[PDB]
Amino acid sequence: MRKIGIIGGTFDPPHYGHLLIANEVYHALNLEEVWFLPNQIPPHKQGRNITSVESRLQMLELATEAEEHFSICLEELSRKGPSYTYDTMLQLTKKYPDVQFHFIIGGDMVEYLPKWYNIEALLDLVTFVGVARPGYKLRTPYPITTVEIPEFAVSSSLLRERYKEKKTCKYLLPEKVQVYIERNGLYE
Amino acid sequence: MRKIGIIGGTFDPPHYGHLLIANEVYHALNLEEVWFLPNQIPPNITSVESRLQMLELATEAEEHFSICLEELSRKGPSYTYDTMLQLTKKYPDVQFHFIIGGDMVEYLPKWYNIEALLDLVTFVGVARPGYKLRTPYPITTVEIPEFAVSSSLLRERYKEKKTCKYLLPEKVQVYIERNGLYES
Numbered sequence: 565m566r567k568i569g570i571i572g573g574t575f576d577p578p579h580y581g582h583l584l585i586a587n588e589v590y591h592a593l594n595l596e597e598v599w600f601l602p603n604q605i606p607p608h609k610q611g612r613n614i615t616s617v618e619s620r621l622q623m624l625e626l627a628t629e630a631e632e633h634f635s636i637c638l639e640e641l642s643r644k645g646p647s648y649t650y651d652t653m654l655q656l657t658k659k660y661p662d663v664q665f666h667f668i669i670g671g672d673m674v675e676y677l678p679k680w681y682n683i684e685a686l687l688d689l690v691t692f693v694g695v696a697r698p699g700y701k702l703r704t705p706y707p708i709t710t711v712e713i714p715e716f717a718v719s720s721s722l723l724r725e726r727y728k729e730k731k732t733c734k735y736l737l738p739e740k741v742q743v744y745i746e747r748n749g750l751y752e
Numbered sequence: 753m754r755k756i757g758i759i760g761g762t763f764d765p766p767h768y769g770h771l772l773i774a775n776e777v778y779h780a781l782n783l784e785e786v787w788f789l790p791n792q793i794p795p796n797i798t799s800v801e802s803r804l805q806m807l808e809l810a811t812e813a814e815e816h817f818s819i820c821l822e823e824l825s826r827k828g829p830s831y832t833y834d835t836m837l838q839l840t841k842k843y844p845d846v847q848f849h850f851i852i853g854g855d856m857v858e859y860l861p862k863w864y865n866i867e868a869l870l871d872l873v874t875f876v877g878v879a880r881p882g883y884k885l886r887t888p889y890p891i892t893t894v895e896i897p898e899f900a901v902s903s904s905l906l907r908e909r910y911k912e913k914k915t916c917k918y919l920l921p922e923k924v925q926v927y928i929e930r931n932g933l934y935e936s
């Protein structure tokens with residue numbers, strides 16, 4: 565079976581941290597490809613902004629288009645509302661019978677896996693890949709694959725605050741995404 | 753209504769980072785107290801006995817910290833919705849503030865029964881100075897400096913037979929090395 569990584573999130577915006585993690589897992593586990601899986605976001609409760617599906621998808625394209633081994637999976641983003649990861653992976657399993665899915669999660673996610681919807685059934689659909697800091701181990705009763713990656717501290721929350729302050733985020737994310745964000749006045 | 757915080761996790765082991773977060777939220781939102789909510793771990797795992805004892809030792813001297821056994825009172829893991837449904841039933845006079853890491857926030861829409869859970873708790877997202885949380889849901893933000901102590905860091909130090917002095921309460925360290933936890 566084809567070894568394919570999945571990295572999910574809202575990518576709001578995508579940045580070098582996401583690419584670094586995707587790349588590290590790609591090399592560490594000798595994957596064929598990594599699919600970025602943009603999540604759906606429910607409409608805001610209190611008349612504030614969420615970043616459109618259109619904008620998030622385009623930023624993601626700009627962030628990944630340079631890498632032949634990165635692709636985008638629209639399974640969640642095409643639906644009307646959020647999806648449980650179990651339901652998504654069930655659907656990807658039906659659509660791609662010959663793929664072994666390696667589902668990337670942060671080290672801090674790991675202790676909370678037992679609280680995921682249909683976790684037991686999901687374990688039969690994917691191999692989890694927990695990203696841990698150098699030399700440190702993840703503790704979980706579940707079978708998981710560990711990949712070591714330094715914590716680089718860049719986050720979407722950091723970048724949004726900078727854009728709110730009308731600063732550049734050059735060197736924290738692909739040039740092309742920075743250009744797109746400031747041009748369309750995102751995160752202001 | 754009494755304002756009470758909830759901080760959940762496996763606490764494996766509890767450490768100054770957990771206490772720092774509970775304390776910051778306690779002070780920021782003028783809470784009555786904060787309840788530590790140990791999670792169940794499905795079938796090496798640290799025994800419930802051991803995790804509870806460590807939590808007890810970690811919170812012994814803290815006046816405004818208590819332990820809530822709700823999730824340990826059930827056999828297997830619980831969704832947070834299940835837990836908060838029971839706690840709201842048990843404490844109708846309480847406004848619960850459920851503490852989550854800033855990294856959790858974008859994934860809230862994937863939590864089981866999130867819409868119904870929003871009717872049961874106020875979420876408190878903790879964020880590093882300079883970080884802005886973004887979610888469609890009502891949430892309260894509390895600024896907390898990152899501290900870089902984690903249970904994973906500690907477990908590895910103990911496996912290497914290093915001390916974790918200054919990273920968690922003395923009484924917890926003593927319990928850990930006496931009982932040989934994290935030795936493997």
Ligand SMILES: O=C(CCC(=O)Nc1cccc(Cl)c1)N/N=C/c1c2ccccc2cc2ccccc12
Pocket residue numbers: 571572573582585649668669670671672673676679680681695855856859862863864
């Ligand atoms: O889809 C996901 C995680 C995807 C992800 O973890 N992607 C990712 C993306 C970039 C880098 C890395 Cl290290 C990981 N599910 N997350 C849900 C989720 C919980 C769901 C139910 C019950 C509890 C949950 C707790 C979570 C805590 C942190 C982060 C996510 C949590």
